[PDB]
Amino acid sequence: DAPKTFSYVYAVDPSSLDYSLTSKSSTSDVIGNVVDGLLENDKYGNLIPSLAEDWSVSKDGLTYTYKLRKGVKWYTSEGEEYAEVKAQDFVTGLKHAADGKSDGLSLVEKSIKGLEAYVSGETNDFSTVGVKALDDYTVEYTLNNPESFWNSKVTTATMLPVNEEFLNATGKDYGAPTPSSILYNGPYFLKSLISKSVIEYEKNPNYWDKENVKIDNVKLTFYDGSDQESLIRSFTQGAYTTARLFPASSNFESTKKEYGDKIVYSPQEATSYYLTVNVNRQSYNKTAKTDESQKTSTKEALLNKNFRQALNFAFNRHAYTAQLNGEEGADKIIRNSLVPDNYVQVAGKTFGQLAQDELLKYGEQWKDVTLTDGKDTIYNPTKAKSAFEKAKSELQAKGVSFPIHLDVPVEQTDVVAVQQTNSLKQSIEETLGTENVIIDVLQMTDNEKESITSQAKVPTQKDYDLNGTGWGPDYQDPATYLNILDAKKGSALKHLGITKGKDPEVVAKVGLDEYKKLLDDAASETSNLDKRYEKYAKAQAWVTDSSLLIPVASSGGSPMVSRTVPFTKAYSQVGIKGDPFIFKGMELQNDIVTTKEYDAAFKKWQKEKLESNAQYQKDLEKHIK
Amino acid sequence: DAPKTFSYVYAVDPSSLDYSLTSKSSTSDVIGNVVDGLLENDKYGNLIPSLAEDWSVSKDGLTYTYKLRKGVKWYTSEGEEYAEVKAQDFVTGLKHAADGKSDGLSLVEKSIKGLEAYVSGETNDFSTVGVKALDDYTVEYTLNNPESFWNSKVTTATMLPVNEEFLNATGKDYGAPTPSSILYNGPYFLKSLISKSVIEYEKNPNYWDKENVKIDNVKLTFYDGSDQESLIRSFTQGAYTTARLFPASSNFESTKKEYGDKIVYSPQEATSYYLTVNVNRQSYNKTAKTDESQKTSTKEALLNKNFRQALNFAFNRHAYTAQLNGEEGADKIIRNSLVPDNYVQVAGKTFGQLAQDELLKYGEQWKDVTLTDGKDTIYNPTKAKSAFEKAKSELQAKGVSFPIHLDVPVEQTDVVAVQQTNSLKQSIEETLGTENVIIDVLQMTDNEKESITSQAKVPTQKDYDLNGTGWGPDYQDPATYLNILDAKKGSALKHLGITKGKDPEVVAKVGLDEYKKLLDDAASETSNLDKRYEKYAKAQAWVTDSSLLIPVASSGGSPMVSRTVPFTKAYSQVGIKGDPFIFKGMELQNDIVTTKEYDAAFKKWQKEKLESNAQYQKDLEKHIK
């Protein structure tokens, strides 16, 4: 349901309940809950009607008139009806503040006409002061000067109403620090006021605005400041509704990890996911195209490198991976390469660092593109439109018809895959415009999607224009990734519609023959790791530029909570000795690992892993004999 | 202490424990914990010694030789010593993989010399294959070609050792999915393997590297994927050490708030804290200056506006408020003005918006300075050095001697105040250089700090050059702040060493007479709120430029946790009806408010409060009669 009791603390006892005579907040903090004035504040600070249901100010700004609500009663400490709140109770309160030498008078002493002369003593009768009860329900204030901020003063303790009969009947005991010494017309009764112990309010069931009083009981235990941690301790046990924390105390950091974020996203792993562009499709059993003019224009468009690059630059990876992971986890799985950035290294430089240095040769469009993990560096609508206009003119000189239709199958029963593909259609069509490119998302069963993609071994059966797939490593060398596009044995050629031994026509068109020379020149380096990894980085740059394997994401990046000490476990990306279920070296702890501790441990591990692998590689020389 | 049991899940049963014959990960995930090979991985991925205590490769890269550790034993399922691990066990394992038609052979089939011919069947004797036991503790591999990634292959299941006696003795039952079907030499014993139920490992107490095995017991309950939420549920009950979360499930968001950050910093409040520059000091009972030449040069320096602006631009507020609040709470209390940004508004434009528009008249140094809350916009070391060089030349033409010494008292027993003042000395001296300015932090008792600042009513007793103090509002008008510098009645003049009715000399030097004309012109507007608040914004711009009241911070910004529904409570900055202990309108809830929910509620409240106050101000017209 919803709680109706509020429990917290207070720090200063009220020495007096006479709100007319003192405005120290140790009194007002009680009185503001139990005694109402002319106006209130809403949740936005606006001065809204309280005991005055309406108010007006004269044209000259000197006269303020308040129309009171009629059915409002004063109530005793015991809850018994005393009398009806009348306009004269506002003359009484202000007259009591003057006669009683109140400390809260300087806000209105020189504003209310004739009041300053009455407090100084040069008049002895209150009739001259600019507060009048024109009738039982009309309070009128007259000021010396116009005050645009006057209404902000009517919510002070000095300006509250006081019943004259009760004031004189109780006499010297009026305003004593006990609940029986004042009368109540506000949202709450003061049920208990025990010095250096407790303050208790209970909702007044006859309050005129009882429906806005949503907390029925309020209890404030006395807090001396001797134990700053009693509050967060009581809150954790459920005794307090709220708890102030103190950043300077010796215990703040422990409090921070107990109530801080604990969800962490595992580091990205070695499997790389990408989209395969079918540049040699001869199966159209599942297409949205109608003409052969559309099939032809699509086939020529996909063979154009500028057109594949325009698709690449137009694809919003964050929106695509926000559908599978979180919005907070969307960047945690993005990969802009095929070989992971740090899969190997030479002289402290990661493979992605090497591959990026070879990438700008292919054109200015690769400026600022880093072949890294964690953030989409490829998506660029400006670059995508610039790439497409170049493709548009090349194709338009070949009788190509626009828009280009692109079939992308997806399993209808896979909600995330549908949402992801719909986002792919969205980002590309938004960037390139639907008069240019149309992504035809074809939803279908598990098996027909599978029958035209993953179990369509024969390339001539691959029935799509774009499809998502992945690849993971088998040995600690870039070739385990980069060999999948090998013109004669590459396993990824069937996903592009290319058979391993045929199609020299298509292989030459997409440039896979130039890639083949890059593969063999890199493979020839059997000993020199520097030359070897430099030459494979040239191959990765070709893949990035080719846009045949439009990168999407990696494995890993899954959210989790854990009491495992992170980055103590043995680590590997090939073999079995660093797999996820390897427990040698792993440490456990009693407390949940917080997100901040995990991210600080990850950055330190990243820094140490770089140094360790580099020192290890230098030490490979000592194992020669 | 530290837990020694790991509890989680597994999803695929091992169909076989014969690691030589299959490399499916449903087998390797078990075997990697219980059977060791030549090399391991450390926590960084490096291939480190395992059963081979050292290894070498020939100059041509074709021959790899591994020196085994001697005291390693094979152990039964029961924990009984079987035999000592010898080099021949690596010939046996690879020969078993060939004879048994293993699926994990394609990694090394064409690398190990003569192996491919043996698996194809054109040789029938294993003596031709490039794996040899040169003695009981020397394994030698011969490759067809050099492979810089070869060692990454020796941690695969296919490459693990196998005892020949046990292999032939157990026969057809070898590798069955039961723990008695293999032998153990790795970190763990396989204690239980019940299909679709449990996998249990126990630490092997005789393991050669037992000190790196820090988890004693591992239990993996079978997880079928039928209930994705069983994992986070079991983790919350303490049954699992870790738990994967699934961002697509209907329950992820609830999981996120249960394990997400819950600490929130209350919004900044109306009290403004600032540093008062003593421009008229005639009490030197607590100073670090020695000469009169230093007192004179300091007195003239503080009267220079460029010098006060250089101090202002040089003061790092984030570092100062990182000592009182958190490092995560440091910006949560910063204020760059005297009047709060949104204290009043005209036509949807906040007072800080008005004041900023009047600020750039005073010079280019106020470019990009916003008079807002939340982020230090004043601190600028470039602007501080540019301001000081202008001050340097003006003062150097008046016989002023550098560095300028500035006394700043602080209560020694107040740790935070000491740390804060030391950071003030740090940031200013780092920016301006210690040959130019020196901030002399004078630590002292509670009372002497109090005796020369807050209870030194007479201005001639103010014994400092800079001191921190604050001021809060009494009515909803900018004048409640801006009147404190009034030349004849302003309460803040004594903090600058200026008496309310005297010192026309000093008042004219710092320009407080020009400020006085700004105050009266603004005060003259009794009705037009637009002209009134525009003219007070001109006064605030003068204060910002004067740098007599160098702004520091606000009240509020305190960290807390709460079950209160935020921004339902009545709100006010003057009066008593919106004070912190006002409970009318406040709502409670059962769950702890998370930081994300509180910050989304704050931004929405900020947006609504702006619209509500503006609609309210337009509606003030209907109350005229």
Numbering used by the authors:
A (entry chain A), B (entry chain A): 31 to 655
Tell me what the authors wrote about this structure, in their words:
Given the auxotrophic nature of pneumococci for certain amino acids, the Ami ABC transporter system, orchestrating oligopeptide uptake, becomes indispensable in host compartments lacking amino acids. The five lipoproteins exhibit pairwise sequence identity of ~52–60% and share a very similar overall folding.
In this configuration, the Lobe 1 (comprising Domain I and II) of one monomer becomes intertwined with the Lobe 2 (Domain III) of the adjacent monomer, resulting in an overall architecture that is identical for the two functional monomeric units. The resulting entwined dimer adopts an open conformation, but the width of the ligand-binding cleft is expanded compared to that observed in AliD, measuring 29 Å instead of 16 Å. The observed domain swapping in AliC would be compatible with its insertion into the membrane, given that both N-terminal ends would be oriented toward the same side. The domain swap in AliC results in an extended interface area of 5173.1 Å2 [calculated with PDBe PISA v1.52], occurring at a hinge axis passing through the middle of the loop connecting α7 with β14 (residues 290–294), extending between Lobe 1 and Lobe 2. This loop in AliC contains a glycine residue (G290) that is unique compared to other homologs, which typically have a lysine residue at that position (K287 in AliD). For instance, AliD presents a significant number of aromatic residues decorating the binding-site cavity, promoting the binding oligopeptides with a high hydrophobic residue content. Both AliB and AliC share strongly acidic pockets P3 and P4 but AliC features distinctive basic pockets P1 and P2.
